[PDB]
């Protein structure tokens, strides 16, 4: 029953991919401020 604390350096980004309406969205977030960039991929491969 304890929780950790993630990194909050001023040059750290986190990335993930999600699904919506059969499309593949990819989200990248700057952590220390909450800045969102997002795109739509045609597939979930490595080149995109």
């Amino acid at each position: 029953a304890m929780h950790g604390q993630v990194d909050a350096s001023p040059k750290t980004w986190q990335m993930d991919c999600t699904h919506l309406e059969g499309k593949v969205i990819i989200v990248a977030v700057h952590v220390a401020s909450g800045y969102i960039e997002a795109e739509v991929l045609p597939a979930e491969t490595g080149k995109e």
């Binding site: 993630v6 909450g34 960039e37 997002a38």
Partner: protein, 125 residues
């Protein structure tokens, strides 16, 4: 999934905004980019009352300015400090004095910062 909790929370926020402004676009890519714009510049509240863009601008500008300021301060310093710490009363070598405060001093030794009280240190010019 709790390790990268920030991007999952931002997935939830982006999906709620996409469901809010879905009826103003035809495709889903335009709605994604409009949800990014609405989240970035049209939502305030947080640490300093900023939005996201003002906060990232403030963070990077403050980082650059404080690096330049502390370089220009630390390039012309003096007043080395020999201090005594540890479980045994030993003496360590040359350390750099950073700030002289009423109660304690800040020393830098081996690229490590420490706070030492004024009873266990002596300054050599």
């Amino acid at each position: 999934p709790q390790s990268q909790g920030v991007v999952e929370s931002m997935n939830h926020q982006l999906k709620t905004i996409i469901t809010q402004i879905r009826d103003q676009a035809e495709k889903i890519e335009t709605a994604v980019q409009m949800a990014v714009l609405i989240h970035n510049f049209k939502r305030k509240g947080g640490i300093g009352g900023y939005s996201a863009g003002e906060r990232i601008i403030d963070i990077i500008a403050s980082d650059l300015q404080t690096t330049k300021l502390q370089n220009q301060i630390s390039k012309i310093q003096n007043f080395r400090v020999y201090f005594r710490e540890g479980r045994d009363q030993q003496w360590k070598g040359p350390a750099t004095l950073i700030w002289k405060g009423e109660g304690a001093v800040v020393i830098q030794d081996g690229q490590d910062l420490k706070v030492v009280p004024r009873r266990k240190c002596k300054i050599i010019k």
